[PDB]
Design a protein around this ligand. Structure first.
Ligand SMILES: [Mg+2]
Ligand SMILES: [Mg+2]
Ligand SMILES: [Mg+2]
Ligand SMILES: [Mg+2]
Ligand SMILES: [Mg+2]
Lengths: 243, 245, 244, 245, 245, 245
């Protein structure tokens, strides 16, 4: 049972038929692959590949991560499901896999996070640098991100060293989870939270579960659960629930 | 008669004499080209090319768009003329064609939009994905952008699926024409002709910005803006009257 | 003696020991290089290198800039020292040289700026274009940037043609030093020691006085006195501060 | 009508259907191309392309050669027909166009040869160098090669600066059309119409190989060869009579 | 129990410690690989990879042939064993896997041969074209090559469509197993077990070279050669007796 | 003074004005370079560069060789002078530096030879493997080559582990300095000074070719040759007197 994988294979076959100049891209990336994991690792490694460190090295490293962490198989599928559930602009499971840099960046972080805890700090920093340049997402490898994360549009995401994001969170573009203290100094974003475009959340503060942070908000103090905050500085302007 | 082409040709010629190391780039992109259209498609294809999908296939596919849409020839030139007229930092028609990712992003979108309407949705998504990563401009292929569009600096632009931008619009970096977050069906802004949108501005929801209006940098616009006004702030308020360029 | 360069070589040697698969990257960019300058020029050239204009051409041109501006040797070391002193997420001098695109964007501008003063505007604009696309930093070649500059995270930086930034300034991502809405000199002057918060927009022919701090998300449309903190849309003075 | 072209397009269509992963290669090289000329020029540019001199610059230059030498359209097709008639290992018109380096090298020579005449000697020598490295054919740009030329397998062919090859010749791999002692002047072979040159044959000096004759494999030819003979051995000696076909 | 595999890993580890700049190459090609088969496929795919057809697609296609053809695992190791035993210039099992183009060209043909039989003739001919350009070995995908084949130096190898090379054969560079002889049908040589073919030798026509025989460098062979002889000369003459060993 | 270098710079300058599209190539390879050494190292590294092992790593390793072997500065110049003096087909000192794979193969070998002597055997074999594939010259890094070596056309050169080539030797394409089949230690030829070796010639065994002698094209040399003679044939016989220069 892997309904997502078989959906993705069917989409890739139709796409190839529908546009056969894309067949090298679709066969290499989806159709020739033995699994969804290897198709995701392959695509991300090809986007991050560079003369400095080949796609192959990245792909091979990704594989060793997947072997030290077989639960990523589940997390990964939950992440794809998040996009499929939450983004109306895209209708296929194949879309975050092939196209969506936010999805690419999340799994890249998962790689660099694992590497970083292994003492492989340069590899992790390399991935961090490459993701920042190619996906425009600067996430410190020490950062903790939950499963079912939705990073929509993504451009300009900054996430600090001691930041934590829990499960089922949605983050848009232009968001900072940063400082400025110099110990634990970055936000903790509890489960189900939505963070709107351009929001700045600064300091070791907490954003309560199910809360919403309106676009352009500057959040300088903890936000309770089930509320909506907005503005510079952010004040409560509404109530909400984990919908 | 094509004064934009011939002036770009003479700009490239001087640039090569001035800096001979750039001769391969200037000849391949401009001087060896038979037309402005071909030069523009070449430059863009080269910026977007990747081992996943070669610049050649992008270039070839661009040309199929120009065949099916000859009016792109005119749209291309008014988009160049917009940069020439509105940006004081550059003085040559060649500058947007060679260097400015905003201009490249616009034409990329026009290709993707055409492809999307033809049912070639993976090709359109691929271009949108590549434009987002390379030009930092995330424009859904279903979005509708008019001619005379000036995308200045560009970085961080997001334009939603149901957005419409009319003619002679100018948009700065860090601009979102997006949704509130509910949110389905027509849920993205309508930007009427002559509008200027300042840096970092967020315009959210199926709301309209009336013709010839100006949105100051950093504004968060949640309700419709009438024509002929300037709005600023979080949330936006009308601060002044204003007119078209 | 060049303790910064000698620490980097040591950091890179241990790095390859620790992770040998990165040996090609680390030997090519650091250990094989005769100097810190050539390691920095080489990394930047590899990042910006493209079929259109090769890394080799970029690297060669960088060396000519170095040859013509000996003082860059000193400026480069103060910029590195700044990341080391001011950023708690990184512990090695090698970090900005290898990974930090803000650092790479600054030295890229110093090259484009020099080129642009030589009349080599196309080479200048090509660098500007590439840096805007690869490092997400759009700095006009005519802008002036002082030494000890720290560009943290960098993504979305926009710096206009007439902008001036003095020594020892720190600038976060999403910053605009731009204009609104004119003709000539229309861009800000950021005096020494200033800190500019994430997302902050500083527009027009205005100045931010020495040691001042602009908070995250501030929109600054009037000149800011020395030794203050400003915040808000639009910004107002919310405090007093000094240099460090 | 251009029957060769139309056959090639149909063959490329079937090929893509039979093995879709080859679709990018087959579309970019054949199906997206507007003419046979452009398909051939494109494939060759891609094979020769390098970071030193991009495929694009090679492809643009080639197109410049075609404009100044409209005769090439014909030469190209008779070269292709030569392969289709003389090689039993291949059944399709597109085989030479996509795959056969001997064919690629002849058309590279034609480009180099024209450049050379134009005083563009670096570009000529660059192609010669790249062809020698990638197709293993070293042909001096000053060499003259006729049409209906068949370079079968090709590896290790060397053709001297003053060599001439007439129409309808077939040359195998390992063939030297080379020099003898030193000497500076006219010093390489003139090969007349219809000659077949066997594998590994060495033909040295300003000597002539007459109309319709056959050099067997491994022959060392140091003296002129009459028309309508077959020669063989070291030193090459006549062994039979032969004619054209 | 894969003593070849285990020695190769150990050679790669030592080589990386000895020359750390080669670490990316040796990790990616050896030490990050799960098997000898995947390392050999990877190396070959990287050497033949091109923007026309990526290394990735080659590697994926290779892995498919391994799947459908489990026999190759054995043929591969008797090939590698052939090199270790027969070449005095190289001391490691890692050497053919990484460096030796003759070894690469052999395994490449085995892929192309399989594809050709599946009806994927274009992919077979692309591999043939690419091998001929990069390894200088032109082997028709319909040629039948036995196990334990040693191709030493390789440059200039040409093997016709109807050729058959039996097991335990050694072939030097510059060798042709070719035709006369565009007669169509069965028209290329049949080389029997244990044969040694010297540099430069040309074997032409549907003829046979019998077991354990030795063809001296430069020989031109136009008629069947019996078992257990050494032939030499242009034309080739039996000059002696020889045993297998 | 360094007249070779100055002449190359002037040639380069002239070439770029003659053909501006080649400016990126000619600046990056010659005009932007501070020495002849660095120009030659750069060209070779760019031809040999691959995703497996970047041109930068090769170029940096070549620098290391130069740092330890300042003597190569002279060896390099006399190698360039050999081409200028001996090849009537090219009139500029720049020609071998840019174009001639035989000259590139020589300096590649000198690097590989030095690495091999340092115990960096894998880097040495990789260079040997790459040169074989890209220049078609298979030279074992343990071979000793003197200065003033002219490798004309080069395709198919094979030089064995224990071969020695003394100064001012000229070797054509298709040449083997190899072994016979009774191999142990020294099993490859010794070519003394001033020898000319003709195209396709095979010199097999631990035999010696004496001073100023000439080996005619196609020859198979199986026993030692005294000084001041020409040999020819299969196998080769002394056919006259000669004397070199
Ligand atoms: Mg390509
Ligand atoms: Mg092409
Ligand atoms: Mg190059
Ligand atoms: Mg590759
Ligand atoms: Mg030559």
């Amino acid at each position: 049972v892997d309904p997502i994988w078989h959906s993705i294979r069917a989409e890739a076959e139709e796409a190839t038929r529908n546009d056969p100049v894309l067949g090298a891209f679709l066969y290499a990336t989806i159709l020739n692959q033995p699994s969804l994991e290897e198709a995701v690792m392959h695509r991300i490694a090809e986007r991050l590949g560079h003369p400095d460190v080949s796609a192959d090295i990245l792909r091979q490293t990704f594989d060793t991560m997947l072997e030290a962490n077989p639960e990523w198989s589940h997390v990964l599928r939950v992440d794809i499901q998040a996009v499929y559930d939450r983004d109306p602009a895209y209708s296929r499971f194949m879309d975050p896999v092939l196209y969506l840099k936010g999805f690419h960046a999340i799994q890249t972080h998962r790689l660099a996070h694992w590497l970083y805890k292994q003492g492989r700090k340069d590899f992790a920093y390399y991935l961090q640098s490459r993701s920042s340049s190619i996906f425009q997402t600067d996430i410190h490898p020490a950062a903790r991100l939950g499963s079912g994360l939705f990073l929509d549009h993504a451009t300009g995401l900054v996430v600090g060293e001691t930041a934590v994001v829990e499960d089922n969170v949605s983050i848009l573009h232009g968001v900072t989870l940063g400082g400025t203290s110099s110990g634990d100094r970055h936000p903790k974003i509890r489960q189900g939270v939505l963070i709107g475009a351009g929001a700045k959340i600064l300091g070791n503060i907490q954003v309560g579960q199910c809360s919403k942070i309106a676009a352009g908000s500057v959040v300088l103090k903890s936000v309770p659960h089930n509320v909506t905050v907005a503005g510079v500085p952010a004040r409560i302007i509404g109530e909400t629930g984990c919908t």
